[PDB]
Every structure is written in structure tokens, then in C-alpha cells.
């Protein structure tokens, strides 16, 4: 069930104006599921609604999260995978043990009580992010507000090597038509190989494997006159299933740009509220599983990185949920 | 043996990184501008 991934992509694309969008739904759902373990009442119900987890118990959500992390960390030793979680809370505050223990058990959360006023705390948190993303996301926070209570942070890291790599000697300078209609000159990689391929009325689809073929990249290339906005707006489990099950091994002459993108989002502003999460961002939020203090979510910061090149792909994401009094 | 299909990414595209056994989408996005 990738409904959350597609709904998060669609809602993000609707509310941001940049040419590139790049998100990790896995990272966002892990950080919010750790937080959901402390929520009660409507606070919890609205978080389950936004996560597309309505109808599941916390026991099932936590067991699924744990089994998913275990599967992804061991399915391909030839691919580098990181899935790390941490909880940083205000020194001297009482944080409930059942909440800490659930997050240590199902998310392998590293839990730390910290002095948020120390000059060492922001570099300890940002340094943790750098450590868990091969230094590709070096900062998740620029500042800590005076009413900070807790940070729940997830970091996903991926470094895969293509099953069939490109040769840098075959990369050539070539035009790429931007979304804004202007053309730019790029480093266009090229190779002729067997890849997974399929088509429909809008697009061409390619599947490019990494390592032992457990992980892959799917590329959706709209036909002339067709748009990525329409692809995004039409994506759902049914359409995704149609693509995946339609893929067949095909001899393909591939031209792909070497590209990098780094994105940053404040998911609390418009995106998570549109997906149904409203009360948790207000003073009416209730998190009795975390503390007796009245706290709420002030920010949900999501940062991502991706580099695609001749050898493979390196991608990283960090999601930090900021809770304040 | 078969004549290859041309798959030339010279315009915006959507892409995703997935894992097959779980079916999970780890990353997904849209590229409208190539950066280095
Ligand atoms: N309830 C207050 C925090 C405090 O009790 O000091 C707000 O901020």
C-alpha cells in the first residue's frame, strides 16, 4: 500500500513552486509514526488519517515499521541502506518510559536527553544527521526555539550501483528541455542494455535495477505533449500496479542526464494539514504518551538529497518532527 | 538481437526508488531542471 507516498507527492507538488520535487515518504511516515505512539484522541486520529493508517492499531503500525526496516536493511548486502531514528528531548523533563521503549524497540530509536541551550546541542543533532546520510544532509535545523521540548528524527540513506553502469566516456553534452520551456545543456549519460520497460497512453516507463535487483529506479517519461503534472495527479496504487506488472525485459538505448537535487520542506504549513493533520499542530494537541506537559508539533522538516550518475544513485532524506511547549 | 527502443530523457520526468520484496517506495520525485 503506497497510498501515502502518492498522496504526499501530489500534495507536495500542489503546494510548492520549484521545478524539482524529491521526497522520501518512508522517512516522513517513520518520523510521524514514532510521534504517533505518544498521541491520544483526535490528535492520534488525525495523524493516522494523514498517514493513511486509519483502521490499523499502533501495535500493527509499529510491528509493520519494524519488519519493514529489518527487510530493507538486509535484502541486498551489495547496496548501502541506512534507516536510523533518534529522539532528543529537553533535559530535566519527564518523558514516559513506555513511549521511549516502544520507539527503541520498533524503530531502534537512539534516545538522548539534551540541554537545548547548549552550543553543543545543534551540532550534535546536525552531526547525527550527517553521520546517518554519508554527509549528504549536514543540517536539519538552523535554530532551536526557546520552547523546544523534543525532536523525533528519521534518516534514510541509499547508495546503489547500477546492475549495468554507464561509462563516463559515453557521457556527452546535450540539450534538456526544462519544465519552464527553456533548454539547458547537460551531461547526458548513455548506454544500450536490457532494462524493464512498458508504455501506456501517456508515457514510457523504465526500470533500472541496482545491486542484486532488490532495489530499482522507475522512470516515468511522458510522451511529447504529455506532462509530469498529469502523471503525478493520476498516480495511485492501481496505476503504480499497472506500471510494475506491465514491465518486460527489453533492449533499450537509454540517454539519461547526470543530475542532483536537494529539497527542503516545512510539511506542517500546508501539506500535512491538507492530508488531514490539523489538531497536532495546535495547542489543543494531546500527547499524554510522551509527557504530562502540554506539547504540540511546531514543524515537520523534511530534507532530501539525490545524485544520479554513471555508477548508480545516492539518495538521502531526513525528517525531523519538532515538538514544543 | 532485437532493435533497441529509444528512451531519451531530454525533458521532465518522474522517478521513484523502490524495493521489490516489500513493494515500498523509498523516494519519489519529479525533475523539471537538471542541476550539478
Ligand atoms: N506552558 C509554557 C511552557 C512552560 O510551562 O514553561 C509554554 O511555552
Bridge partners of A159, per DSSP, are: A80, A314
Q: What is the DSSP letter of A200?
A: -
Bridge partners of A152, per DSSP, are: A87, A321
Check B29 against A21: CB less than 8 A apart: yes
Rounded distance between C-alpha atoms, residue A15 and residue A51, angstroms: 18
Q: Would you call A260 exposed, middle or buried from its count of C-beta atoms within 10 A (0-12, 13-18, 19+)?
A: middle
Question: Hey, of A4, A8, A13, A26, which one would you mutate to test binding to chain B, going by the most B CBs within 10 A of its CB?
Answer: A26
Q: Say yes or no: CB of residue A298 within 6 Å of ligand 1.
A: no
Q: What is the DSSP letter of A231?
A: H
Where does chain A break, by residue before each gap (C–N > 2.5 Å)? Answer: none
Nearest to B20 among A216, A304, A306 (CB): A216
3-state secondary structure of A177: strand
- Answer whether A5's CB lies under 8 Å from A275's CB: no
Rounded distance between C-alpha atoms, residue A57 and residue A92, angstroms: 31
What residues of B are in the A interface, CB distance below 8 Å? 1-36
Residue whose grid cell is 519529479: B30
Q: Specify binding-site residues of A for Zn(2+).
A: 66, 106
The H or E element containing residue A140 is: none
Which stretches within A152-296 are classed as H helix? 228-234, 237-246, 271-274
Q: Say yes or no: CB of residue A147 within 6 Å of ligand 1.
A: yes
Length of chain B: 36
3-state secondary structure of A215: strand
Q: What is the resolution of this structure in A?
A: 1.6
Residue A22 Cα to ligand 1 middle (Å):
36
Rounded distance between C-alpha atoms, residue A156 and residue A150, angstroms: 20
A133-154 b/e (C-beta count within 10 Å ≥ 16 → b): beebbeebbeebeeebbbbbbb
- Answer whether A206's CB lies under 8 Å from A218's CB: yes
CA distances from A178 to A93, A171, A195 (A): 51, 19, 25
Residue whose grid cell is 528541455: A177
Rounded distance between C-alpha atoms, residue A125 and residue A46, angstroms: 28
Rounded distance between C-alpha atoms, residue A8 and residue A232, angstroms: 11
Q: Whose CA is nearest to atom 4 of ligand 1?
A: A325
Which experimental approach was used here?
X-ray
Chain A's closest residue to B6, CA to CA, is A253
Check A178 against B23: CB less than 8 A apart: no
Amino acid at each position: 500500500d503506497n497510498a501515502f507516498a502518492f498522496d504526499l507527492l501530489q500534495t507536495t507538488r500542489k503546494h510548492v513552486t520549484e521545478a524539482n520535487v524529491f521526497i522520501s515518504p518512508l522517512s516522513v511516515s517513520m518520523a510521524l509514526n514514532m510521534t504517533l505512539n505518544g498521541a491520544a484522541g483526535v490528535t492520534a486520529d488525525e495523524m493516522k488519517t494523514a498517514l493513511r493508517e486509519t483502521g490499523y492499531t499502533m501495535e500493527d503500525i509499529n510491528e509493520y515499521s519494524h519488519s519493514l526496516r529489518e527487510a530493507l536493511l538486509k535484502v541486498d548486502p551489495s547496496t548501502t541502506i541506512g534507516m536510523a531514528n533518534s529522539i532528543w528531548y529537553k533535559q530535566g523533563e519527564l518523558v514516559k518510559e513506555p513511549f521511549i521503549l516502544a520507539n527503541r524497540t520498533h524503530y531502534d530509536a537512539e534516545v538522548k536527553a539534551v540541554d537545548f541551550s547548549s552550543p553543543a546541542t545543534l551540532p550534535a543533532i546536525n552531526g547525527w544527521c550527517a553521520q546517518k546520510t554519508n554527509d549528504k544532509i549536514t543540517k536539519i535545523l538552523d535554530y532551536i526555539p526557546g520552547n523546544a521540548f523534543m525532536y523525533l528524527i528519521n534518516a534514510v540513506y541509499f547508495k546503489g550501483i547500477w546492475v549495468t553502469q554507464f561509462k563516463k566516456s559515453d557521457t556527452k553534452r546535450a540539450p534538456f528541455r526544462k519544465a519552464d520551456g527553456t533548454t539547458q545543456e547537460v551531461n547526458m549519460m548513455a548506454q544500450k542494455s536490457t532494462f524493464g520497460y512498458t508504455t501506456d497512453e501517456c508515457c514510457q516507463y523504465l526500470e533500472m535495477d541496482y545491486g542484486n535487483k532488490a532495489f530499482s529506479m522507475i522512470v516515468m517519461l511522458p510522451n511529447e505533449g504529455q506532462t509530469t503534472r498529469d502523471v503525478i495527479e493520476q498516480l495511485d496504487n492501481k496505476h503504480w500496479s499497472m506500471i510494475i506488472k506491465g514491465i518486460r525485459p527489453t533492449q533499450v538505448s537509454l540517454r539519461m542526464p547526470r543530475f542532483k537535487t536537494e529539497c527542503k520542506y516545512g510539511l506542517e504549513k500546508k501539506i500535512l494539514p491538507e492530508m488531514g493533520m490539523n489538531v497536532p499542530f495546535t495547542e489543543t494537541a494531546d500527547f499524554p504518551g510522551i509527557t504530562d506537559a502540554a506539547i504540540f508539533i511546531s514543524r515537520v522538516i523534511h530534507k532530501t538529497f539525490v545524485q544520479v550518475d554513471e555508477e548508480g544513485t545516492e539518495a538521502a532524506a531526513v525528517t525531523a518532527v519538532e515538538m514544543v511547549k | 538481437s532485437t532493435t533497441p527502443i529509444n528512451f531519451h530523457i531530454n525533458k521532465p520526468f518522474v522517478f521513484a526508488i523502490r524495493e521489490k520484496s516489500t513493494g515500498v517506495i523509498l523516494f519519489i520525485g519529479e525533475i523539471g531542471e537538471v542541476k550539478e
